[PDB]
């Protein structure tokens, strides 16, 4: 029955950018004009919907008393919050709030959080914190880091611990066990559900809140579809109900996100169009028309100057650019143009409180780029400047002193500072995962344009969006409820299917078809067959669409068993999970990447070949080496310490030297090259951990030493020959380079006094601190008691003694170690095991009993390496020596069953 | 060995299997933009309407003043996108009568009359725009205005300087009779037989 599909035919190659609509119909007073090289499309400020005659902003004194403590500072509620306080607090329905961005969607999430918090009230006390958990899935990580602060302020009176899922998997399961509001990205929560670190607390998860669920349209869409198909499938199997609250932007196919979330379209579905936006924004779209890109860049700079000067003295402007260098570049560019046309004094009139606060805040400033602009109205805000200086920009812009803030996108996620005018300059970000300059996402544009209009002062937002003209219709469909939310799951369908195979959620192709029916792809394939490669002939011949789900499951499973992720027989349709499958699911690496690591990982790989096997990952299949950076790459290739076998105009050499230039902390210069480096290292964490797990599972001891060291070198951003005191980030780097200059072994520092250390480094001031940090460094003392069980097996009882002072600020709740027992050649791991040294049980011996095999050429030793899973140069090797080992005799063979004729009882 | 030669590159597209002939054509359009034969060969190589549409969109972005590329890109679209693209075709190829005639076929009467008016303003020396105006007039509800067009036709075409053929005009009447507008062919054949007594 099964027919193999063309799985890359059916995908949408634009990704987050695909327009399902052909037409984009605008509001009424929404003219367009071809000015000079650009077409300007105005869309006026939508008048808000006149209030229903029996609908009012209820105060917080009408919502129930357990929820009144969360709304501090709030007298009334929003209109959107007043429309569904009854569906978020009185009803346990799954919700889909499709509101405009900035229209108070996080207080709706707080209402659902207060309903689930208000089921544990504990009459004399306040909150029974440990019977429930609430997941808040927000798309960007800085949005998560500010939602942690917001929900930590609002739920402070309940004692509810809000935290962000970060760190390694042990840190994440400890943070899940410790906290109630778990704010995370979809990818972090999905990698926890794949690795399994929430399995003990999924009966405690009673509410997941999917902030910005129009990320279903993004290339990060399959993560959210996998998360919600997994949660809805566990609701239909395990029958413990979780409440799903999808917050969205007002975009089409919202009824399909409602059917996707199991939202009943009567009780749970709430669609507020852009009239319900609180500060109604007049949105301008400059689509630059001409076809020579340097004239397009000059026209873009002329347009940001003209639209700055349109709101010169009247309003604040928040310009949004793509790069951190571009922030200061176009701040100084519009400042040089305002100084050129003598319009610089329009921002700062002699409002001497304002310009004097700006002048004395400029002269206090440490940022020499921000000090150039702050005497005038201008300022910059990227994530690269200081926390003090960027919160200086935040507080100087919230007090209407900074007339023009220029920023990257991260401010739009990280801070709720809204301006009157926002001006998104360019819409072109260099995405290294595509390896090219692609358009800004739906998420980033909707969040940048939620900052238009501040809810206190402004009666009307103003959002200018300077684009290419061919990309004008995308953003017109996006910001005017006309860009449909379409599933991108066919891009990542074998990876999500492998995650369901690894978790055991699907076993045969029928359960995989059942799981695919819970995805957003199934509802979008049902509602729009033509867009997803289905004819209406096929929907009339398959109305529930089961043969297309069998074809998708069969095609994804052929991609899985071709890449050796799943043992898939076409006879019965059953899946068997491979350990490569577990590693690819646990570390999110694609099926082509584990096929690369299955072909390329040999036991005999050096450190040279390991960077090459890493660099041939299919995560970097779009990384190309451009010629404009090749010169800089040569200046890296003569300085990186691991040699590269490739030539530098091959991309694998670029990924190789970018990883090595990251670990070496070489300062890079090209923006494309720094972006490719940041991408390959944020992938290199999981990719090197997946190589380490493949290599550890197959038992290769030299390569697992190399790969675990390279995991810790990518994570700690230092080479392992550097001092281990760089993993304590609290030291001065000058005394650490004085330690590396005086190159003795690091284990020499243990035997010295705090005087003796300080005079060996010639730093007697630093000596006590170096002693404290060398005794904070993890150091296990191993002792072995080996007992020959048979001739073939020994029982090793390894006592692990922590010889380091535990400190919660450097070690945390636990220190993870690997116990690797390997032969004389140290090339076969005979026994590896994970060892959690928990913080309750430091300073006492751990008995780890295991059994190692012993083979007929009786080895002189085994080696027990107890290495840290996280810390560089934290390794204790212990030679289990077999010199005086008297093995037992090879035991006599058992007595055979002589085939006696069977004994009757008369015998 | 011979870059900047369109016929060698077309031979190279024609002798490969099509999927590596796509890379051959990509080499050719790196070597030779503004080259419409390579782009129509790129269109014929891909065997799906979406990819042919994208390739001819890139082709029209490269060289926009070629009537063959507009003919190749219009034949893939369905009539509303086809007339939207044909309006830009006759805006970019204003001296090509075939795009004007296909557009006036592709539009409503109050728009087709403006389009044929603009085609006669750009291209006065054509006789197919006049017979297409007759076919448009008879094709919709009017019927007596048709002879008023043709008598206005052969006037201005004798005022510009093209003689009437007695072969091409009766061929226009014959293809009109094969196109179901016999009353326009009647008056056209009357004038053509009149201007070409017992002999």
């Amino acid at each position: 029955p099964r027919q193999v599909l063309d799985l890359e035919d059916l995908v949408f190659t634009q990704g987050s950018h695909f327009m399902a609509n052909k037409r984009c119909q605008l509001p009424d007073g929404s003219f367009r004009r071809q000015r000079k090289g650009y077409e300007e499309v105005h869309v006026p400020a939508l008048k808000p919907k006149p209030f229903g005659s029996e609908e009012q902003l209820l105060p917080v004194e009408k919502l129930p008393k357990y929820a009144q403590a969360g709304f501090e500072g709030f007298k009334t509620l929003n209109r959107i919050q007043s429309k569904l306080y009854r569906a978020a607090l009185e009803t346990d329905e799954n919700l889909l709030l499709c509101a405009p961005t900035g229209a108070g969607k996080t207080n709706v999430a707080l209402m659902c959080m207060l309903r689930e918090i208000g089921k544990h009230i504990n009459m004399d006390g306040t909150i029974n914190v440990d019977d429930f958990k609430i997941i808040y899935i927000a798309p960007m990580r800085s949005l998560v880091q500010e939602m942690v602060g917001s929900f930590g302020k609002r739920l402070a009176t309940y004692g509810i611990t809000v935290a962000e899922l970060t760190g390694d998997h042990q840190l994440c399961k400890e943070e899940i066990s410790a906290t109630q509001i778990i704010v995370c990205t979809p990818e972090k929560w999905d990698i926890i559900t794949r690795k399994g670190g929430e399995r003990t607390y999924t009966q405690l998860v009673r509410l997941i809140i999917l902030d910005e669920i129009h990320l279903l349209h993004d290339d990060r869409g399959p993560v959210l579809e996998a998360l919600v198909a997994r949660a809805i499938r566990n609701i239909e199997m395990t029958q413990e109900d979780v409440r799903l609250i999808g917050l969205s932007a007002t975009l089409p196919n919202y009824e399909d996100v409602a059917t996707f979330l199991r939202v009943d379209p009567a009780k749970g579905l709430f669609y507020f169009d852009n009239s319900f936006r609180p500060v109604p924004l007049e949105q301008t779209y400059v689509g630059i028309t001409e076809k020579k890109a340097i004239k397009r860049f000059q026209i873009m700079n002329e347009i940001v100057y003209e639209k700055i000067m349109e709101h010169a003295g009247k309003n604040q402007v928040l310009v949004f650019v793509h790069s951190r260098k571009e922030t200061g570049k176009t701040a100084r560019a519009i400042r040089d143009m305002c100084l050129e046309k003598d319009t610089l004094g329009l921002f700062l009139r002699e409002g001497s409180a304002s310009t004097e606060v700006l002048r004395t805040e400029a002269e206090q400033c440490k940022n020499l780029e921000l000090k150039d602009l702050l005497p005038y109205g201008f300022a910059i805000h990227h994530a690269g400047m200081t926390r003090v200086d960027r919160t200086l920009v935040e507080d100087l812009f919230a007090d209407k002193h900074i007339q023009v803030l220029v920023s990257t996108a991260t401010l739009a996620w990280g801070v709720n500072l809204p301006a009157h005018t926002v001006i998104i300059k360019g819409t072109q970000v260099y995405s290294p995962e595509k390896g090219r300059w692609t358009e800004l996402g739906a998420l980033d544009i909707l969040q940048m344009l939620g900052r238009a209009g501040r809810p206190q002062y402004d009666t009307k937002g103003e959002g200018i969006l300077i684009t290419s003209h061919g990309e004008l219709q995308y953003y017109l469909s996006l910001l005017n409820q006309q860009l449909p939310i379409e599933s991108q799951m066919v891009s990542k369908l074998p990876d999500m299917l492998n995650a369901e195979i690894v978790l055991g959620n699907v076993q045969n192709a029928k359960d995989a078809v059942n799981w695919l029916g819970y995805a957003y792809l199934y509802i979008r394939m049902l509602r729009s067959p033509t867009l997803y490669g289905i004819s209406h002939d096929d929907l009339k011949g398959d109305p529930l669409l089961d043969q297309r789900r069998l074809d998708l499951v069969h095609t994804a499973a052929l991609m899985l068993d071709k890449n050796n992720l799943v043992k898939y027989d076409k006879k019965t349709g059953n899946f068997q999970v491979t350990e490569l499958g577990r590693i690819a699911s646990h570390y999110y690496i694609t099926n082509d990447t584990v096929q690369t690591y299955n072909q390329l990982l040999k036991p005999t790989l050096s450190e040279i070949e390991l960077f090459r096997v890493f660099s041939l990952s299919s995560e970097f299949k779009n990384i190309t080496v451009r010629e404009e950076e090749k010169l800089e790459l040569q200046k890296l290739l003569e300085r990186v310490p691991i040699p590269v076998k490739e030539s530098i105009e091959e991309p694998s050499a670029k990924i190789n030297v970018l990883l090595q230039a990251f670990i070496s902390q070489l300062k890079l210069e090209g923006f494309a090259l720094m972006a490719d480096m940041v991408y390959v290292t944020q992938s290199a964490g999981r990719l090197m951990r997946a190589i380490f797990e493949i290599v550890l599972n197959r038992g290769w001891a030299q390569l697992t030493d190399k790969t675990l060291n390279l995991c810790k070198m990518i994570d700690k951003r230092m080479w392992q020959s550097m001092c281990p005191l760089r993993q304590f980030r609290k030291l001065p780097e000058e005394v650490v380079k004085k330690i590396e200059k005086k190159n003795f072994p690091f284990e020499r520092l243990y035997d010295l006094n705090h005087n003796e250390i300080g005079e060996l480094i010639r730093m007697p001031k630093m000596g006590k601190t170096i002693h404290k940090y060398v005794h904070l460094f993890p150091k296990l003392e191993l002792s072995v008691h080996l007992q020959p069980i048979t001739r073939s097996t020994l029982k090793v009882e390894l006592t692990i003694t922590p010889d380091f002072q535990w400190d919660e600020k450097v070690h945390g709740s636990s220190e993870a170690f690997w116990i690797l027992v390997e032969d004389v050649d140290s090339e076969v791991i005979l026994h590896h095991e994970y060892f959690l040294l928990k913080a309750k049980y430091a300073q006492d011996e751990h008995l780890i009993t295991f059994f190692v095999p012993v083979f007929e050429p009786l080895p002189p030793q085994y080696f027990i390496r107890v290495v840290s899973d996280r810390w560089l140069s934290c390794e204790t090797q212990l030679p289990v020596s077999f010199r005086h080992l008297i093995l037992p005799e090879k035991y006599p063979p058992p007595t055979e069953l002589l085939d006696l004729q069977p004994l009757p009882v008369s015998a | 060995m011979c870059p900047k030669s369109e016929d060698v590159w077309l031979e190279a597209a024609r002798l490969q299997p099509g999927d590596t002939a796509k890379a051959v054509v990509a080499q050719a359009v790196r070597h030779l933009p503004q080259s419409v034969r390579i782009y129509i060969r790129a269109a014929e190589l891909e065997t799906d309407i979406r990819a042919k549409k994208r390739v001819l969109r890139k082709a029209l972005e490269h060289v926009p003043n070629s009537v063959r590329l507009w003919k190749a890109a219009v034949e893939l679209e369905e009539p509303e996108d086809a007339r939207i693209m044909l309006s830009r075709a006759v805006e970019c190829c204003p001296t090509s009568v075939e795009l004007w005639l296909a557009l006036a076929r592709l539009e409503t009467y109050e728009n087709a009359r403006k389009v044929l008016n603009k085609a006669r303003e750009n291209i006065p020396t054509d006789r197919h725009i006049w017979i297409t105006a007759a076919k448009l007039e008879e094709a919709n509800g009017n019927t007596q205005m048709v002879e008023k067009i043709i008598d206005r036709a052969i006037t201005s075409l004798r005022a510009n300087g093209v003689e009437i053929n007695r072969e091409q005009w009766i061929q226009d009447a014959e293809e009109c009779d094969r196109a179901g507008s016999v009353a326009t062919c009647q008056a056209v054949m009357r004038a053509v037989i009149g201007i070409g007594e017992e002999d």
């Binding site: 052909k22 | 006759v90 389009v115």
Partner: peptide
């Protein structure tokens, strides 16, 4: 009302564009 269209905007960004005010029907 202003209706944006994929084919219409692609054909708008082609060409010369003083020439978009030709062949009326615009």
């Amino acid at each position: 009302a202003i209706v944006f269209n994929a084919t219409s905007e692609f054909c708008r960004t082609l060409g010369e564009i003083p020439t978009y005010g030709l062949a009326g029907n615009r």
